[PDB]
Symmetry: D2
Subunit: 116 residues, 4 copies
């Protein structure tokens, strides 16, 4: 699949499991249209979100529900979620892995982009 998300927990040193992830694509009206969604696995990974055919060029938004994750763990986090916004496939099909590292009051996100 061309879009993968990987989430890690910096407090426990483990993959962030069952984290809700919603992806949106900017429409002509500049509004965010639902594109795909899923939950991270036991390895903190989410695959099968889309296909090369469906994943056309556009501006995408990957919203990771970090809040529900921390609350489920008995922690009141700072952020509502982690949002990664980017232009995808504007120079041909690419493979994207959006990685996120979570902490109650902090998060980092990196993008690994390779050719198909």
């Amino acid at each position: 699949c061309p879009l993968m998300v990987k989430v890690l927990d910096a407090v426990r040193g483990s993959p962030a499991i069952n984290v809700a992830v919603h992806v949106f694509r900017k429409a002509a009206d500049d509004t965010w249209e639902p594109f795909a969604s899923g939950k991270t696995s036991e390895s903190g990974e989410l695959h099968g979100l889309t296909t090369e055919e469906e994943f056309v060029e556009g501006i995408y938004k990957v919203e990771i529900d970090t809040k529900s994750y921390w609350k489920a763990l008995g922690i009141s986090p700072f952020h509502e979620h982690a949002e990664v916004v980017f232009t995808a496939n504007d120079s041909g099909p690419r493979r994207y892995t959006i990685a996120a590292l979570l902490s109650p009051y902090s998060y980092s996100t990196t993008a690994v982009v390779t050719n198909p």
Copy 2:
């Protein structure tokens, strides 16, 4: 000023100067409404965004224009911008410092809430 933003450049190891920052407050209509904005100083900081009496509880979004920042440096960036969405509560501490560390294909943000 109960809300401050600090941005750093991880490629050049310096404060990220002249980065546009927009703050929004979630309205009852669930839409985002402009609240405050400015550009980071020579030290990569942005203060005087709001006042204690205007900064009421609610959900705020701090949008940092990282794409323009990198493009002015002649560097190809991945993200359109960096967005930090959070609920400001009177329960916890008073001052909110939103810090961001920038790289072309990566960014981290941390909140320092003190009294």
Copy 3:
């Protein structure tokens, strides 16, 4: 293998390839004895550093040569290397993945520790 290292390049959004990695283990004399070494692959990964039998409890140091990596790229980095020091296997055998994200003047490192 019980010890894996993964390195990513935050400037190019790609795995950090051919990065030299040296691992050391603290001896009785508190000196660092060479334990294992390798280079990251095209996926920015390094496996086969050791075995569950050789990877006994102790204090280990994983030194990632970030300097040679950036210099080879025509960049004069700030750090000499990235050093991750930790106690391993003190409560039984564990699997460790030391992940590092590199930038010329910054790096972050996270540890993912799972059971065998």
Copy 4:
């Protein structure tokens, strides 16, 4: 003070207070020799480590005792400490700020070199 250290706590979203910091300078014997040390203040900062005339070019190691920091908070940490090794050059800018963001199983460090 040409060398400053700033430490933040990513779990509690606050400055990391009272963290022991040791600085070392590489001697010709390749061994590490004590140079300066102290503990972060209430704002998580450590200044007055050295002076411009004592801070000559060379390889320095800034060792942050993160393990003790977490243990005092009753949190199990992964790292023994955080070590930042770098060469100080007169060529580039004057002031060196070593910033570190701490989490129990993760830490990031950034260098802000300014004039």
